Design a binder for this molecule. Structure first.
Ligand code: ATP
Ligand code: ATP
Ligand code: MG
Ligand code: MG
Lengths: 501, 503
């Protein structure tokens, strides 16, 4: 055999071996330099046209010669030195010059390549135009290039529900023309939502078909009936073709799906609500959290969608009302714009009210989200919890939202040393991100408003009157500052908040 | 047919028959040396790609030639002597010079990028990164190289449940680049869990497909309906292609599965809870036990996963609490880390408590194990026991865990002339069928019971059945530290009243 460079030279010099070069002329000389067999020679010497005696002379040559020499020592001898010189020069700018082009651009316009073509068969969705989160979309791409060498790995883009985890993939894959082509060769993107015990197999049924190209979606058999093991090994098969290929698993909720991408040794990205699905993986597991929208970042998001900026004082405040409500949440923001009809501080403030008094359902819209209001979405990240975690949850309604509070101070309204309350609470601000893991000054959690007006218009009416009474019970006996235990027996600073019941 | 060495040479020299070798070139010459049929020849001469006219030329060749000769007497004639020479050398370091074959005509092609390949397709799972048990992973690989010559054999990697038997295979196969390529040519890895009377056939249904390459997973017929005998002989068929091939049978529990790998004369590794499945084998049966984690080894496991080391005294003790609890058990350890939230001696000691008072379910996690808590796992190794062994088991809760005690001293709480030699008999069947106790011979025939293998029982046996074993204890109990408690002082088990209080 030869190699990519030695075969690449017979590739490069081709509109020349088309114009002038009779193969027969070389047969006698190459049956001799022992790079042919008499069946070979005649096999090529009796062809109808030359494009045959040439394509056959080339295909057959790249097999027999211990190198490319006994062919330049022929174009020289055949009055065709003008050929053997080109090929000589090509051997020189490869073995003497250790450089040619690097995987880059001499065939430009990846604008429908890396874009359109490669992305659309990855089923990547349209990236976002009118706002882009730098910080994160950047960090991601970075943590990708870092691993494009690695042989299998898990990138967890964990975050809040509806909080815009998927858009950043569509952006961080569509923005940079390196990830596709350069770092990774192809892309395959599947939304999971594996709830069933069968969704997680079936996902990797449609991946196998995401792989299987036009190469028989007709011959698509009864894939539906195959063993877990057969489909799996039958993907290892289909994988020869797609080396350095990247999977996006938009919205995973089953941990079996992750068990699967590590059984299969897959390079994958994951967008998920629940983070602990990563324990199923003993691997290069690296994560990027998707914070509630920073107080500065949101502002920018606003003007991005022609949304008016504060003139006075208690009008930016009647905007801080909204950032306070949608405690940093893209999708519940988008439901707003879409539903801020006039666009005045006026009609926005009508809504700040519809919210305190109709929860998330008071903005329920046709947002580009696959959900009406957030409530529809959250409903799920709820039913997933343990019947025990579920209980301890819907009780922590009765609270100060956007207020930082001690563990014992929570122990009062919660079911079961109150070290176990501490335990559930963390399982929560982890399994769908619902609170706050704050270590110092003192082991305290929080509860945002979005993650509240959901609860608010969702828990059985009596269950609130009950949590509040259960509050006052303990509550007795013997601003940038956490409220100490010199003054716990009264939660009266927040009587204010507590009035709204 | 040929054989493992004659077929192993066409296996070894393969990134060469990929780079340069047209099968058609050999058809005319082999229809002639009478090692083909005209249907055969055209059958291979009209293929779309060469990887076909090559895989078909190889599969078909290993059938027709009384030996491998009429193929080296061709690569010589086809200007491809650089091939026929490799294969000549390979015949030489097998029929003349034993041994020199692996160092010489095999290693200079070792490719660490080709493991990975071989491995993904053996369905070997990702080896473990952040901790590796030297002692064992090493011993294994050793006991493998020892047999890569042998024609069929059983390596039993027996051990406790969840105690990390399978990880060591993924490591001992993925760490050393000799086992794959050098010692053994290819690898096939299947998790058994054969409970049904049909799981054990079906396993060897999916192996047959593990073998059958892209060569018709489309044409996969109604394999489901074939006789035991036909599938079996139909694997002997499929085996011509995979000589020196290694099977891993992650977690076997049916002994029929072993009857099968010895009917088939298979080179296999086995990870298992129950050890007696080896009696079904009259063979080179060699075993490696997987001990509870050594008291030093565990420590290392800890720091491996950024876990804090003892500053004071009764804080390493409130670590020795945990090693004492998970009486050397990887998977029940992993459930811990995953669930040691802050990571302080504090929050770890909260858990030392959740354990004494919620058994294994007090750490039940999403560990990389295929089980929540160990309990889910053990449940099985339990329902396997004989209804009689099952009884004698759940009674030996009422005990001192991590305490070494006499047989008669057990005879008291256990079911069944007048000689308690039968208690002795069940107890051994136990620390063998899932490893549950302790086979200690001298000073005196005594067993033990670890804590993990206890807080399972603890939160599992019917409440009354404990109040009952304890009363049944005191009954006999009367009548007429590095030292076993003698029989001068048996009538009182009061040293362990301490332990016994927790009831
Ligand atoms: N420019 C933008 N960048 C990021 N997110 C945006 C942008 N514009 C709007 N969004 C909001 O995010 C919504 C969809 O977000 P996304 O699907 O990423 O959330 P998610 O966290 O993936 O939720 P899930 O995984 O549960 O579907 C949009 O319909 C919109 O409400
Ligand atoms: N080297 C290791 N590093 C970290 N964790 C380990 C290691 N070995 C074992 N474990 C623990 O054990 C789990 C898998 O254990 P393993 O599969 O080895 O046990 P097993 O004896 O095979 O049980 P079974 O026979 O039922 O498969 C891991 O998810 C982890 O919790
Ligand atoms: Mg989405
Ligand atoms: Mg296992």
């Amino acid at each position: 055999m030869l190699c990519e460079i030695e075969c690449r030279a017979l590739s490069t010099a081709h509109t020349r071996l088309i114009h002038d070069f009779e193969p027969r002329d070389a047969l006698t000389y190459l049956e001799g330099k022992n790079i042919f067999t008499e069946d070979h020679s005649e096999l090529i010497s009796k062809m109808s046209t030359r494009l045959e005696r040439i394509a056959n002379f080339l295909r057959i040559y790249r097999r027999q010669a211990s190198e490319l020499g006994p062919l330049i020592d022929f174009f020289n001898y055949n009055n065709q030195s003008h050929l053997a010189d080109f090929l000589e020069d090509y051997i020189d700018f490869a073995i003497n010059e250790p450089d040619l082009l690097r995987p880059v651009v001499i065939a430009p316009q990846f604008s429908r390549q890396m874009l359109d073509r490669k992305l659309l068969l990855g089923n990547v969705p349209k990236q976002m135009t009118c706002y882009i989160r730098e910080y994160h979309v950047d960090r991601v791409i970075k943590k990708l290039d870092e691993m494009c060498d690695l042989d299998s790995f898990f990138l967890f883009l964990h975050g809040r529900a509806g909080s815009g985890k998927s858009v950043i993939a569509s952006q961080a894959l569509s923005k940079s023309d390196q990830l596709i082509g350069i770092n990774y060769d192809s892309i395959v993107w599947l939304k999971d939502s594996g709830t069933a015990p069968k969704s997680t197999f079936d996902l990797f049924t449609d991946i196998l078909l995401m792989l299987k190209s036009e190469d028989d979606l007709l011959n698509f058999p009864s894939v539906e009936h195959v063993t877990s093991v057969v489909l799996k090994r039958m993907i290892c098969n289909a994988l020869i073709d797609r080396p350095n290929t990247l999977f996006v698993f938009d919205d995973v909720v089953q941990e079996e799906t992750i068990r699967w991408a590590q059984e299969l040794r897959l390079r994958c990205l994951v967008t998920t609500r629940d983070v602990e699905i990563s324990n199923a993986a003993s691997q290069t597991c690296e994560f990027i959290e998707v914070t509630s929208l920073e107080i500065d970042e949101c502002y920018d998001f606003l003007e991005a969608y022609g949304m008016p900026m504060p003139v006075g004082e208690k009008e930016e405040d009647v905007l801080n009302k909204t950032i306070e409500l949608s405690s940093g949440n893209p999708a519940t923001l988008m439901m707003f714009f879409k539903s801020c009809e006039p666009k005045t501080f006026e009609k926005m403030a009508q809504l700040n009210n519809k919210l305190e008094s109709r929860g998330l359902v008071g903005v329920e819209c046709i947002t580009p989200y696959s959900y009406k209001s957030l409530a529809m979405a959250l409903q799920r990240c709820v039913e997933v919890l343990s019947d025990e975690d579920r209980s301890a949850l819907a009780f922590a309604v009765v609270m100060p939202p956007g207020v930082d509070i001690p563990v014992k101070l929570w122990s009062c309204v919660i079911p079961v040393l109150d070290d176990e309350v501490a335990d559930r609470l963390k399982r929560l601000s982890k399994r769908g991100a619902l609170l706050s893991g704050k270590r110092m000054p003192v082991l305290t959690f929080k509860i945002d408003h979005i993650i509240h007006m959901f609860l608010k218009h969702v828990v059985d009416a009596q269950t609130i009157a009950n949590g509040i009474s259960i509050l006052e019970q303990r509550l007795l006996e013997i601003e940038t500052v956490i409220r100490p235990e010199d003054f716990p027996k009264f939660m009266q600073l927040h009587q204010k908040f507590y009035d709204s019941l």
